[PDB]
RNA sequence: UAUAGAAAUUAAAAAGCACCAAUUUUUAUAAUAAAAAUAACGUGCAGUAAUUAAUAUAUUUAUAAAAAUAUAUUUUUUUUUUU
């Protein structure tokens, strides 16, 4: 364990300057934080949307559990995976069976994430055997990608283009979005080399 | 540029009257070319007041590398508009 041995060594260095310092809060936010845990439940609660029924959903479904498997194997980076995460979630055929299951009204996504928490218990796609239900719980109570009524962070980067341009109101209407240089004062350190981003301030 | 941390962001090319010998000008009256002069091209001290929107066309003034007048186009940073 790695994480029990860094909170050791903060334990340590903690009782040994007396004080908080910076060095070693930082260095156990990035033990803490090295899991991919959650790309996984990315994949999960995209897939707990779907229906068990449908051979279309079905092809999603085993396309994201391979997409997950393949993250907690190692094997696929995560740029290349979010790549392929976010071009499954922008086809039609996912938002429709998202807009059916909304439709519904006794929807089958909450037993959908309970099975996924089972799920990345058993396959070990976890740190913590049980650390898959303290994130379901996370998931649940806490604004996320689960409480979202089509299952995927609602970030702009996993809606569709056609549906981004009339709502939000961007640079110019009728990828890397940059500030051009005719902007010399834009603000006290923003420049052509800070990037902006469409539906967050990430600042 | 800001009702002065312009201690900020800045290469996405704004350009080629005198000075410098591709050349050019003048003349011989009953005598008929060898004498003189001028290079071609672009700057040019022209500024400041924390001065000063820019570009294009036309006209007038010897601050002419300047300045003025008459139109057109562009520049707005989101609290006005949306086939």
Same mark, same amino acid.
């Given at each position: 364990?790695?994480? #029990?041995?860094?909170?050791?060594? #903060? ?13 070693? #809060? ?14 996984? %439940? ?107 009524? %089509? ?26 979005? %940059?500030?051009?240089?005719? %902007? ?20």
């Amino acid at each position: 364990d790695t994480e #029990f041995q860094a909170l050791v060594e #903060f334990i340590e260095g903690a009782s040994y300057d007396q004080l908080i310092s910076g060095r070693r #809060f930082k260095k156990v936010y990035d033990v803490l934080s090295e899991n991919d845990d959650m790309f996984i %439940w990315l994949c999960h609660t995209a897939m707990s949307v779907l229906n068990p029924g449908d051979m279309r959903s079905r092809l999603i479904y085993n396309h994201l559990r391979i997409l997950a498997e393949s993250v907690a194997s190692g094997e696929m980076t995560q740029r290349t995976a979010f790549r392929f995460f976010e071009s499954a979630v922008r086809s039609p055929a996912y938002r429709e069976i998202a807009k059916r299951q909304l439709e519904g009204g006794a929807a089958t996504r909450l037993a959908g994430i309970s099975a996924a928490a089972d799920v990345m218990r058993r396959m070990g796609l976890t740190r913590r055997p049980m650390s898959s239900y303290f994130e379901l719980y996370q998931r649940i109570v806490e604004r996320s990608e689960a409480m979202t009524p %089509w299952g995927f962070p609602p970030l702009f980067q996993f809606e569709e283009r056609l549906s981004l341009e009339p709502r939000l109101k961007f640079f110019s209407r009728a990828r890397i979005f %940059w500030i051009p240089p005719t %902007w010399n004062r834009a603000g006290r350190f923003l420049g052509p080399h800070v990037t902006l981003y469409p539906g967050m301030t990430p600042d």
